[PDB]
Amino acid sequence: DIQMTQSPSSLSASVGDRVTITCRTSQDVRGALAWYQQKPGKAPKLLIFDASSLETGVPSRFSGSGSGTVFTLTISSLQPEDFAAYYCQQFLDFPFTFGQGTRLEIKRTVAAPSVFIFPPSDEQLKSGTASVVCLLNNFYPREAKVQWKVDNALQSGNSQESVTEQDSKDSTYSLSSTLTLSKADYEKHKVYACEVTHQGLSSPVTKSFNR
Amino acid sequence: DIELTQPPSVSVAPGQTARISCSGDSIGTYAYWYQQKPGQAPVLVIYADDNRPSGIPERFSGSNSGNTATLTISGTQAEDEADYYCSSWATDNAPVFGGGTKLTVLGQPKAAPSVTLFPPSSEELQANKATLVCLISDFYPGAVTVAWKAVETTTPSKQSNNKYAASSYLSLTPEQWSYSCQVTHEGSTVEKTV
Amino acid sequence: EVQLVESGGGLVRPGRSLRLSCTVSGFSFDDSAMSWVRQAPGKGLEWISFIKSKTYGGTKEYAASVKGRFTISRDDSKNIAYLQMNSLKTEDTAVYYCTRGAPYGGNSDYYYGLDVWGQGTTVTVSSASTKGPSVFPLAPSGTAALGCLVKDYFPEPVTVSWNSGALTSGVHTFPAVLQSSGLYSLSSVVTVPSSSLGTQTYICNVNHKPSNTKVDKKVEPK
Amino acid sequence: QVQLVESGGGLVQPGGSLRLSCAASGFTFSSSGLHWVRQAPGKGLEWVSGIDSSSSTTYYADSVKGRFTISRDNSKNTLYLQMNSLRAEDTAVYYCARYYFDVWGQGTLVTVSSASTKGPSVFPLAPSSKGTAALGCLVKDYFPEPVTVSWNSGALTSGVHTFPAVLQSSGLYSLSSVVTVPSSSLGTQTYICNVNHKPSNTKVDKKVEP
């Protein structure tokens, strides 16, 4: 097969600037790449064809370049339209593999998140499943690390992480961490806390709950 | 490469399924099926494994597994009778074609063909020529085997009465000119003495 | 214009056959190549199968991940493309797209792109049955956090309303998470002033359409 | 629609030369290669020649290798197959088909026969046995037919079944016409066989008697 790497997955840009997205190939595709744009939760669209040639229905801001192994998309002015996910696909020999994908996020000032610790549910205490909810609202950049520390010891393998998409108004993010602990596990621990590592945060701020 | 092995003829009752197999020596790829009405160019009914082109009714369905392919004609109609050929692509990128199968739908009741013998003619004897004439008429279905007992036999042809007919011509020298003709239509064997 | 629709997507237990149909209208189906692209929720796009037109033999061929389990067929008379999957697995839970591979020139064997994409249908592979949502209050222990935890959601898409739909600003609905058991987990976040926390009656409305179950929960300080 | 028409085929002497032309309409010729398929009479299809779309390579059947050449005149939207040193059994109808065999043309008849216009020999074949009897005449060495055989100069129309012609190994077609008549009328009905050899422009009259 042909390996397909897109660099970097997360690319940050402001409105009206220039954006480069690079698709790198293993062998030489002979100028037969196709660039696709996917808006969130909707069908992907054909953006750039035969490497350089532009497909009908796309304005002039989108362009392609390069041949052989390196291929790039240059966008002249980034509109609100087009802030989405971009994919590249190979068309030399079967199979038509897709790249990892590149996500375009609106550039914004570095804002630290707000740490909210949701205590264990009183109704869910007798249900049989005990959960601890950590909520981070208004966090920028998308990358953040949440560590579930129980009794001063980090817990791993029992956490589910969810991320909210960029808000259409302020362009922020939300992060939710759920720690799954049984009734015996919930009772055994003494102090449960979550440690948040963010670019805005100077030190890891941890909020603890008392059983 | 050897041609794909196919049954010579298949008999199916009207409104009842038809099964044709295309087991072959390493087809290795997808098997296409073709339909040939006599006197007409072959047309495609099944391509790849079980795809159907436009203009082909749903009654044609296909399958492929291992080294065998099958055309399933569910509820065949009388007008459908034709020769079905299966083709595939070998490793050398050269097409290979199958022998073919005839869909003998039993539209009419089965009947034993009538055979008329023909001894040598007086003119042929005077001219030193011998011709054993075996005319098999009123055959159903149109598939008869002609044998000579002591030889060019025409292929079966549809008769004006809807009964298959055929002729068997045997050449013998005037010196060598009893002669018997054997006819086998469907299991039964018909023998005529001359 | 050119329209592609899909069907056959639903809940299927592991190891059971399911057939998707791609109805094609607005353009000629005989001479166009059809490909299926799947997108796992959250993950990237994955290319599943490709079948060439009738003019080029209709050579079906698939990626290494689905070879031996996915068979693709097409009928030109009813302009419909079929994808059949046997030995279905939990990793195949995704959204499947029907794509038309446009030829290089008018008609050529070199394919340059997938031009028109269908809206897509959701194929879910799971063992659990339809379970009603479970509402767990998350009481607020400047801006306070009030929310409800949705646990044990089965075979579904759910709607969360804050203040019976009155509170629209500051409502953050997290994406669904596939729990280990087989149910979905959802979270709702409401940010309100601390003083207003004890005044407004924060009412959460959760509707589980597949189960026809409506759950209402109240978030109050503990 | 995609339509193919082939022509240029006819009866030739063994070892002669023949060129068959395919006309293509509705699809770009340079996009797809074309195949030649031959149908021997009394038998199924057989692959003869193949050409890739770009004329990059040419695939030939082993039974015809070294004798047939196939060129694709992409300029005039035509496909040509050139035949030299044909042998006897190569007689068939040649079909011109698109690569992967999607569309087939009507086909062209190519006959390899050293025989020329030869008059038939009306050897009588009367019913030697016997309520009804079958009698008629046999036309031997008719080249190439269709030979019109009539009973009583067209007077008799019921009971006369004309068997299809047989392509004997001698290269001359043979025909047999049999008339089924009652046994009592064998000595009364005038059994007259008239043969009109259209290819040879010969009208042969024969008399059938008990």
Author numbering:
A (entry chain N): 1 to 211
B (entry chain L): 1 to 150, 159 to 185, 190 to 206
C (entry chain M): 1 to 141, 144 to 224
D (entry chain H): 1 to 130, 135 to 214
Task: Please give sentences taken from the publication describing this entry.
RB1, a monoclonal antibody (mAb) that binds to site IV of the RSV fusion (RSV F) protein, is a potent and broadly neutralizing against RSV A and B viruses. One potential approach involves using anti-idiotypic antibodies (anti-IDs) to mimic specific antigenic sites and enhance preexisting immunity in an epitope-specific manner. Methods: In this study, we isolated two anti-IDs, 1A6 and 1D4, targeting RB1 CDR regions, demonstrating that 1A6 competes fully with RSV F in binding to RB1. We determined high-resolution cryo-electron microscopy (cryo-EM) structures of RB1 Fab binding to 1A6 and 1D4 Fabs, elucidating the differences in the binding mode of these antibodies to RB1.
Interestingly, although 1D4 anti-ID interacts with RB1 via both the variable heavy and light chains, they only engage the heavy chain of RB1. This structural observation and the scrambled CDR3 interaction data results delineate the importance of the RB1 heavy chain in interacting with 1D4 heavy and light chains. There was no commonality in the interaction of RSV F-RB1 with 1D4-RB1. Conversely, 1D4 only shows partial competition with RSV F in binding to RB1. Our cryo-EM data for the two complexes, when superimposed to the RB1-RSV preF crystal structure, showed that while 1A6 shares the same binding site as RSV F to RB1, 1D4 only partially blocks RSV F from binding to RB1.
